Symmetry: C3
Subunit: 202 residues, 3 copies
C-alpha cells in the first residue's frame, strides 16, 4: 500500500499537506526522512520555515522519519544570534567605515546541530531554537518554545518548554526505541500500523 | 438601551468590532451569549478563529455574555489532537491504503467541551486549548496559552498560562457570582452600568 | 565615520534595516536614541509596531541608543488595558447612549512609562507589555513576553519573560555601566568598536 513519499503533495487536492523531504531535499545541510509531513498554515512550503540557516556556518538540520509538523512551526538555525561577548550591536551592517568590523567566524555563536527524531509530533505555531535535539517519538505542545533538549517519548511544552511527562512506562519506551519501526521495510509497516498505533508491536 | 445584540457590526461605520453571537450563528455546536465582541486583528471575523472544530467529534463551544475578546485570540477544538496511545502519525489522512487505519470516534481523545464564562476578558493573541473552562469575571493576559480551567475573577496569563491573583476580594466574587448581573434584562442592566463598573452593584 | 542616523534606511537600496529615531521622530511621546535599528518582517515599519499608544493617556516610550530590535517586536502601551475596578466590558465602545459610562482617566490603569535602554538586543516576536523598563545591555530571547522590568546586562526569556543569567560577571557590568560608552563622541566610539565588541573596553 501507500502514498508516494516523493510527491510534494501526496494528497490529490490537499495542497496544504506536504511531505517535507523532497522540498528540503534540495537544501544543503538539510537531511530529511521520508513520510514526515508539514501542514501548511497559509500554503507556504516548509523550506520557507527554516530561518537564519547559512551553509557557511556548517550547522545541520536532521529530521527523522514519520514526523508530524503543524502550521507555524519555525526552526531557528544558528544565523539568528547577535555576537554577545561584547556589545551585541551589529556595527558592520551599516558600512561607511563600520563595514570593517564583521565577526570572524569563531567569535560567532555555535550552539550545535538541530536534531528532530522519528515519529515526532510538533504542534502548531512551534518554535525550535538553535541547538536543540528532539527525542524519538516526542510530543511538543502547541505554541511551545523549545530551547532545551527533549528526551524521547517525552511530552514537552511551554515558553520556555519543559518536559511535562513521559507518554509511556519507561520500559515501553526502552523497547520502542529498541525496535525502531520507522526503519522497518515499508512492506512490513503496512501490516503493523495498528500494532504501531496501539503501541503493541512491542 | 445600547446597541442591538443581533447586529453583526454594531458600532457605526465600523467593521472591526463584532458581536459574536450573530457571527457564529451559522456554526453548529457553538453557543454564544449576547454583547461579547471580537476585535479583528485585520478584518478576519471571529468564526475563523475557531480552529479544529469538527462535528462528528461531538465537542461544543460555549461562550457566555459581556465578554471582550481581543485580536488574534484563537480557540482550538478537539479536532487538533493526534492519537497518542502509540504513534501520533496519521497514516490514514494520506490514505492510498492507509485509510483503513482512520481512528475510531473513541480511539482518539476528547479533552472536553470549552467553556468561557460571562464578563470574561481575553487578551490579545491568546490561545485557548480544548477542554478549558474560564469562569465569569475572569481575565486572561495577552499572548497566553491556556491549557487549564480558569476560575471566576482570576487573573491568569503566561505559557503555560497560570493563575496569578484574584481581581477582587472574595466577599465580592462570591457575591458577584451570586447576583449574576449579566443575566439581567438589558433595560435593567442599563440603569446599573456605572455601578457594575465599580463593583458596588453588590449592595 | 559611520552611517547616518538621520536616515530611516541607512543602507541604500535596503528598506528592511531601519534606523528607528528618524522614523518615530515626530511620533508623540516617543523618544528614540541614535543608531538603534529595526529589521523588518514582511515590510512593516517600526512605528507600526507601537500599539495602543494614546497621546491622551500621557504615557511615554523611551528607547536608548545602539539597540537592536528584531522583526515583529511589539511595544504595547497602556491603551490596551480595560477598566478593572469592576466589569472589563467596555460598555462605552458601542455608543447608543452608553457613552456616559466612558472611563474618566484615573479609572483606567496607568502602568506608566516604557523604557528600553542603551545597547539592548530585543528578540524577534518579543512582546514588551505596558510599563516595563529594560536595562542597558539586557537581552530578550525570541517570542518572549516581558511583563516585569529587566536589569541591565541580563538575559531574559519566556512568557512571562524572566531573568535567566547575568551576561557577564557583576564587576565587569559595573565597569560597563560607569563608562557608558554609548554616550561617547561617536568619533571616540568609532575608534574603539573592536574593544566595544570584545568587552575589552574596560581594561
Ligand atoms: C492534524 C491536526 O489537527 S494537528 C493540527 C494542530 N495540532 C495541534 O495544535 C495539537 C496541539 N496539542 C497539544 O500541544 C496539546 O498540548 C497536547 C496534545 C500535547 C496535550 O496532550 P495531553 O497529553 O492530553 O496531556 P495534558 O493535556 O493532559 O495535560 C497534562 C499536563 O500538561 C500541561 N500542559 C498542557 N499543555 C501544555 C503546554 N502547551 N505547555 C506547558 N504545559 C502544558 C497541563 O497543565 C497538564 O497539567 P497536569 O499534568 O497536572 O494535569
Ligand atoms: C482597546 C483594546 O482593544 S485593548 C485590546 C488588547 N488588550 C490586551 O491585550 C490586554 C492585555 N492586558 C494585560 O495583559 C495586562 O497586563 C493585565 C490585564 C494582565 C493587567 O494585569 P494586572 O491586574 O495589571 O496586574 P499586574 O500587571 O500588576 O501584575 C501582577 C503580577 O502578574 C504577573 N503577570 C502579568 N502578566 C503575566 C502573564 N502573562 N503571565 C504570568 N504572569 C504575569 C506579573 O509578573 C506580576 O507579578 P507580581 O504579582 O508579584 O507583581
Ligand atoms: C538577523 C536577525 O534579525 S535575527 C534577529 C532575531 N534573533 C533572535 O531572535 C535571537 C534569539 N536569541 C535567543 O533567544 C537565544 O536563546 C539567546 C541568545 C537569548 C540565549 O543565549 P544563550 O546565552 O546561548 O544561552 P543558552 O545557553 O542558549 O541559554 C542559557 C540558558 O537559558 C535558557 N533559555 C534559553 N531561552 C530561554 C527562554 N526563552 N526562556 C527561559 N530560558 C531560556 C537555556 O535553556 C539555557 O539553560 P541552561 O541554563 O542550563 O543552559
Amino acid at each position: 500500500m501507500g502514498p508516494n513519499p516523493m510527491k510534494m503533495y501526496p494528497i490529490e487536492g490537499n495542497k496544504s499537506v506536504q511531505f517535507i523531504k523532497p522540498i528540503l531535499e534540495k537544501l544543503e545541510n538539510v537531511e530529511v526522512g521520508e513520510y514526515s509531513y508539514y501542514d501548511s498554515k497559509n500554503g507556504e512550503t516548509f523550506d520557507k520555515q527554516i530561518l537564519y540557516h547559512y551553509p557557511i556556518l556548517n550547522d545541520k538540520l536532521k529530521i527523522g522519519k514519520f514526523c508530524s509538523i503543524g502550521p507555524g512551526v519555525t526552526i531557528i538555525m544558528n544565523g539568528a544570534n547577535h555576537r554577545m561577548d561584547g556589545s551585541t550591536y551589529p556595527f558592520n551592517l551599516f558600512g561607511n567605515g563600520w563595514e570593517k568590523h564583521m565577526p570572524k567566524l569563531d567569535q560567532l555563536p555555535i550552539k550545535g546541530d538541530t536534531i528532530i527524531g522519528n515519529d515526532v509530533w510538533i504542534g502548531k505555531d512551534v518554535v525550535i531554537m538553535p541547538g536543540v535535539k528532539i527525542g524519538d517519538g516526542a510530543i511538543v505542545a502547541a505554541n511551545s518554545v523549545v530551547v532545551k533538549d527533549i528526551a524521547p517519548y517525552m511530552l514537552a511544552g511551554g515558553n520556555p518548554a519543559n518536559e511535562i511527562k513521559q507518554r509511556f512506562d519507561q520500559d515501553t519506551i526502552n523497547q520502542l526505541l529498541d525496535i525502531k519501526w520507522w526503519n522497518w521495510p515499508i512492506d512490513i509497516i503496512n501490516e503493523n500500523i495498528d500494532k504501531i498505533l496501539d503501541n503493541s508491536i512491542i
